[PDB]
Design a protein around this ligand. Structure first.
Ligand code: OGA
Ligand code: MG
Ligand code: NI
Ligand code: ZN
Length: 331
């Protein structure tokens, strides 16, 4: 078996190997990359996502989210308080202010220490889940706005034709902005490109061990667990590397820098934070190996997680039994 210790693998495709997305994903998996739950892909040196970022200040963040923490430094929840709209210009100015800017630090490890020590005492503002793309339409390789759709994958694998579309989202981050422990909707893959700015640190649990993370989460967030049988779909819970180590949960960590792709694999729980002002673009995607994960994915039926138009059809076709009660939570 390849990659038995489930380490995060880093790939360096040539421009030749960067032409066929599906085939390169299948290659990574042949080398065991999926066992980690997360891979890094460094694009060929000749590739660019777009010519410059010079005019991005006019993008609107219509609902910035202030991420308010509760609990203890290593085990906390975050609530998203909706703020007034601001442009990317305004946001970047805010991120760079004395109140929100990245503190002095020696290296990524010192900054990671400061993050876990101090995250709870600040409420950074996250511009998340903004429908859009920053790839130039003339970028033909690994353009997250031109991937084949999950609906088309299901059609090609399973023969069923469903409604729905699949488009990317932009994320504008600042120091301490945080993504809580989650797998993707319907345990899909995701791919994330860091377009510009400061790094993003990731933590991930191997898919084969995801249930161990869930068991810990139920113990650490006991009332959440009683309220919903898939409360990690709410994307509010954080657990530090220290706490994961104390409880024997297998995980890995890696820092993504501007110009790099990360791919999360089905049922690979991940969480992380931003080092400073940045802009990422991400989208979900499917392969043939995903299909069974889609059939087995947990669902939030308490009604908090409240998910897309397109996810309806996935649940309808892959999880017909659930479909009924899941849509009671979604209506
Ligand atoms: O970048 C972020 O804030 C969150 N991204 C993801 O969870 C992902 O790409 O799967
Ligand atoms: Mg603009
Ligand atoms: Ni994700
Ligand atoms: Zn729920």
């Amino acid at each position: 078996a390849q990659n038995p210790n489930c380490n995060i693998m880093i790939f360096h495709p040539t421009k030749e190997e960067f032409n066929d997305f599906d085939k390169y994903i299948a290659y990574m998996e042949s080398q065991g990359a999926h066992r980690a739950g997360l891979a890094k892909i460094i694009p060929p040196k000749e590739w660019k996502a777009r010519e410059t970022y010079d005019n991005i200040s006019e993008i609107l963040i219509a609902t910035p989210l202030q991420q308010v923490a509760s609990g203890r430094a290593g085990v906390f929840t975050q609530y998203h308080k909706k703020k007034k709209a601001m442009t990317v210009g305004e946001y970047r100015h805010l991120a760079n202010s004395k109140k929100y800017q990245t503190p002095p630090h020696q290296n990524f490890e010192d900054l990671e220490r400061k993050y876990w020590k101090n995250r709870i005492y600040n409420s950074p503002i996250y511009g998340a889940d903004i429908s859009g793309s920053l790839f130039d339409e003339n970028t033909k390789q690994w353009n997250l706005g031109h991937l084949g759709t999950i609906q088309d994958l299901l059609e090609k694998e399973c023969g069923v034709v469903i409604e729905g579309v699949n488009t990317p989202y932009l994320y504008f981050g600042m120091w301490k902005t945080t993504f809580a422990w989650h797998t993707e909707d319907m345990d899909l893959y995701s791919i994330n490109y860091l377009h510009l700015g400061e790094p993003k640190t990731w933590y991930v649990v191997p898919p084969e061990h995801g249930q161990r993370l869930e068991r810990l989460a139920r113990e650490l967030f006991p009332g959440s667990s009683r309220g919903c049988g898939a409360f990690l779909r709410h994307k509010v819970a954080l657990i530090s590397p220290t706490v994961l180590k104390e409880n024997g949960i297998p995980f890995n960590r890696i820092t993504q820098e501007a110009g790099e792709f990360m791919v999360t694999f089905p049922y690979g729980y991940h969480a992380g934070f931003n080092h400073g002002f940045n802009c990422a673009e991400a989208i979900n995607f499917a392969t043939p190996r995903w299909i069974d994960y889609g059939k087995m994915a947990s669902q939030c039926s308490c009604g908090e997680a409240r998910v897309t138009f397109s996810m309806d059809a996935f649940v309808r076709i892959l999880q017909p039994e659930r479909y009924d009660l899941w849509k009671r939570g979604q209506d």
